């Protein structure tokens, strides 16, 4: 059964307004793949991927302004979301109830990240510090200062050593989680970095910026492993494959590009979307890709393994 | 002013289903500023039109810039300033139908206005907000000018 | 005397220098 890249499902009018984030999580006990999407229409929606179909499970409300980020836990059945009003909410995906809320003021809590143990939420802030909130505590345990401008994206390394941040000026900052010290401050790009990610082995750091370029870094030495181009507009999201030899990115040019880190060449491009593709993610085993954008559509793409 | 609608159109097809009349041809046009769709019968013997032509189209309820209304009778000896002076092809007609995509609960988002210029038919179709001056049984003028 | 804060600018921005492929 030869396997090729190709769309498999397409949910139209998934949200009333633009979909600004997505997240894919796999739960062993339930053995059901879950997708969490946040949109500018102030709604979180929980769908279940079963029988090659998407079926809505929960539709959670509460966010005041647009939902900027939605994340899931790797082990727990928890999810988190943040709105444009800096409010953070935790949702129990088993029952679709709000576990707790964190009012991060008017400025803090831009974008969310789950720690590898799912015991913390890392979020960039307007001032230039990455605040950390206890998932169980619900309070700002501490913060790591960058002395930089707005932090647009946040990432957690799968091994938990470092958390990366990308600023509005293109500067990247890697912090050691154990000691909370700014390991590296890299020039990066000259345009805002809206999305950076780590490799499954925590060896590579892939960052995306408005200049249309995707930069690869070796976190061990923080050296520039390569630069990728091919997007005709802003790159809005990146996400690494589980197989660790591929990753996927999305852009304002309405396309989703899958790149090979080895050959450093885009191996596929999807043009299905009709507007800015704001989110792209891989499934647990790397055989599916979910993408969401301003056209209020959810697209699932098959992938060879 | 008395202007109901105005835009620039590109002729995209002429008599797609073949020529039905010797002196009249049906234009299929699209506008760019407002993305309006147009079907228009034109006397091509006196006003020839070719594929890819561009024209400025105005639908007006009056020809007088002072907004005064008309009796609907031929008044050839009137020499007040007239919008027709700025245009090459001018027709006088009546709105005979307005269709929309409204439901039993929702107002229309897309309207189609149909006009008959003594039997030369026009259909202007697009977003309902562009077509809010059109009322069934009202008389309108069509003003056209090729531009190079 | 309250309204959306937006200063309207009438801009005349020239195009970038053309660099079309050359004909031989």
């Amino acid at each position: 059964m030869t396997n090729q890249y190709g769309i498999l499902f397409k949910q139209e009018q998934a949200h009333d307004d633009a979909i600004w984030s997505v997240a894919w999580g796999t739960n062993k006990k339930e053995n059901s793949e879950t997708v969490v999407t946040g949109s500018l229409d102030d709604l979180v929606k929980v769908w279940k991927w079963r029988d090659e179909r998407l079926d809505l499970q929960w539709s959670l409300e509460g966010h005041q302004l647009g939902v900027v980020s939605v994340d899931i836990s790797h082990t727990l059945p928890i999810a988190a979301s943040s709105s444009l009003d800096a409010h953070i909410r935790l949702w129990d995906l088993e029952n679709g109830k709000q576990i707790k809320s964190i009012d991060a003021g008017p400025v803090d809590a831009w974008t969310l990240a789950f720690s590898p143990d799912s015991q913390y939420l890392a979020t960039g802030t307007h001032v230039g510090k990455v605040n950390i909130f206890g998932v169980e505590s619900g309070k700002k345990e501490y913060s790591l200062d960058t002395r930089g401008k707005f932090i647009l994206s946040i990432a957690y390394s799968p091994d938990g050593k470092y958390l990366a941040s990308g600023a509005i000026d293109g500067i990247i900052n890697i912090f050691d989680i154990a000691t909370g010290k700014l390991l590296h401050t890299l020039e990066g790009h000259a345009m805002p970095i809206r999305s950076l990610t780590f490799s499954p082995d925590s060896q590579l750091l892939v960052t995306a910026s408005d200049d249309g370029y995707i930069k690869i870094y070796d976190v061990q030495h923080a050296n520039l492993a390569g630069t990728l181009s091919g997007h005709a507009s802003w790159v809005l999201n990146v996400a690494f494959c589980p197989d660790d030899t591929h990753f996927v990115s999305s852009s304002s040019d309405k396309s989703v590009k899958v790149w090979d880190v080895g050959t450093r060449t885009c191996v596929h491009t999807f043009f299905d979307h009709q507007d800015q593709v704001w989110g792209v993610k891989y499934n647990g085993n790397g055989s599916k890709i979910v993408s969401v954008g301003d056209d209020q559509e959810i697209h699932i793409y098959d992938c060879p393994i | 002013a008395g202007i109901l609608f105005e835009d620039i159109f590109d002729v995209k097809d002429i008599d797609p289903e073949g020529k039905k009349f010797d002196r009249v041809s049906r234009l299929h046009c699209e506008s760019e500023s407002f993305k309006m769709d147009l079907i228009l019968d034109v006397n091509i013997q006196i006003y020839p039109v070719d594929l890819g032509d561009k024209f400025r189209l105005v639908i007006a309820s009056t020809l007088y810039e002072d907004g005064t209304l008309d009796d609907g009778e031929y008044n050839p000896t009137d020499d007040r300033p007239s919008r027709a002076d700025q245009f090459e092809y001018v027709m006088y007609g009546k709105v005979y139908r307005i269709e929309g995509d409204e439901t039993s609960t929702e107002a229309a988002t897309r309207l189609s206005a149909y006009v008959s210029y003594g039997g030369l038919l026009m259909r202007l179709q697009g977003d309902a907000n562009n077509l809010h001056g059109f009322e069934v049984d009202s008389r309108v003028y069509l003003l056209m000018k090729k531009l190079a | 005397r309250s309204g959306v804060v937006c200063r309207v600018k009438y801009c005349n921005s020239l195009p970038d220098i053309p660099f079309d492929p050359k004909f031989i």
Binding site: - | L147, A148 | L14, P15, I17, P18, D20, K22, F23, I24
Partner: protein
């Protein structure tokens, strides 16, 4: 041999507005001078 240059990129294909624009400017100037 290249056809598009920094001088022809600012030009319309054929349409000329010199007469109309200068007539409009004359009216504006005339109205400005009339008022005092």
């Amino acid at each position: 041999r290249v056809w598009r240059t920094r001088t022809t990129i600012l030009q319309s294909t054929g349409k000329n507005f010199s007469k109309n624009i200068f007539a409009i400017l004359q009216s504006v100037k005339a109205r400005e001078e009339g008022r005092a």
